[PDB]
Design a protein around this ligand. Structure first.
Ligand SMILES: *[C@@H]1O[C@H](CO)[C@@H](O[C@@H]2O[C@H](CO)[C@@H](O[C@@H]3O[C@H](CO)[C@@H](O)[C@H](O[C@H]4O[C@H](CO)[C@@H](O)[C@H](O)[C@@H]4O)[C@@H]3O)[C@H](O)[C@H]2NC(C)=O)[C@H](O)[C@H]1NC(C)=O
Lengths: 55, 173
């Protein structure tokens, strides 16, 4: 069925590439390549909350 | 009053006394007044302080706990997770409330008990030299004065020093 006017679908994927590791992409179509990626700084006791209170 | 003193044989409180939780009333010819008892009051103070702190220490403060998301094929484990959240919440709610109920009774008992101790500690000092005139009151068989009033609250009242006087007084009844 058309969703946001699209009979096509696209699956999004993620992964944590560890220091030193290499990630290789091979394709003959259908790849939505990474353009920008994110280097992560681990904290702790952060989190996600759902709120409509103002900052 | 489980110890029969408070709301018991000593019917009322003394909005007059503001020195402390436990104290004496006196009326020597020189005048009237209130004087709270240091030793007992400071004890009760200390103890009840310890009691609140001890209860609160047993509560580790809560650290970051944010809920977890699940997708629609994860209903069992989303339900497992709710079961845990609800299960611990019941237990802490029950512990908190139940403790406070039970310990409130103990605290009030404590106060009742301290008061009875006080009274009886005086009573064992006076004996003959005064009579049980009701509602935690003694009546001196001898005349006594403000500085003498301080011997009572001292826990050092000299029973012999007035035993003579009180004897011939009491014996006129
Ligand atoms: C950012 O988020 C907002 C959502 O807050 C989003 O805008 C919203 O998107 C939907 C989809 O475009 C809009 O609802 C549509 O309104 C149009 C025009 O009036 C209707 O024709 C649409 O109905 C048709 O398509 C539906 C399926 O997609 C069918 O259910 C329906 O039967 C019709 O065929 C549809 O309801 C909505 O108007 C806005 N909301 C607001 C407040 O504007 C925006 O698209 C998002 N942007 C990005 C980049 O993701």
């Amino acid at each position: 069925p058309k969703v946001r006017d699209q009979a096509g679908r696209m699956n999004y994927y993620w992964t944590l590439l560890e220091p030193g590791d290499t990630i290789t992409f091979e394709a003959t179509g259908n790849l939505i390549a990474p353009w920008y990626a994110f280097a992560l700084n681990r904290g702790s006791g952060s989190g996600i909350i759902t709120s409509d209170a103002p900052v | 009053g489980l110890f029969g003193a408070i709301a018991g044989f000593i019917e009322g409180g003394w909005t007059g006394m503001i020195d402390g939780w436990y104290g004496y009333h006196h009326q020597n010819e020189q005048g009237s007044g209130y004087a709270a008892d240091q030793k007992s009051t400071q004890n009760a103070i200390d103890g009840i302080t310890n009691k609140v702190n001890s209860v609160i220490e047993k509560m580790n403060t809560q650290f970051t706990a944010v809920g977890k998301e699940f997708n629609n094929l994860e209903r069992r484990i989303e339900n497992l997770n709710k079961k845990v959240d609800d299960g611990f919440l019941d237990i802490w709610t029950y512990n908190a409330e139940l403790l406070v109920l039970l310990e409130n009774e103990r605290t009030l008992d404590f106060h009742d008990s301290n008061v009875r101790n006080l009274y009886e500690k005086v009573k064992s000092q006076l004996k003959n030299n005064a009579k049980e005139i009701g509602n935690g009151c003694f009546e001196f068989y001898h005349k006594c004065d403000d500085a003498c009033m301080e011997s009572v609250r001292n826990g050092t009242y000299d029973y012999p020093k007035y035993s003579e006087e009180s004897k011939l007084n009491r014996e006129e009844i």
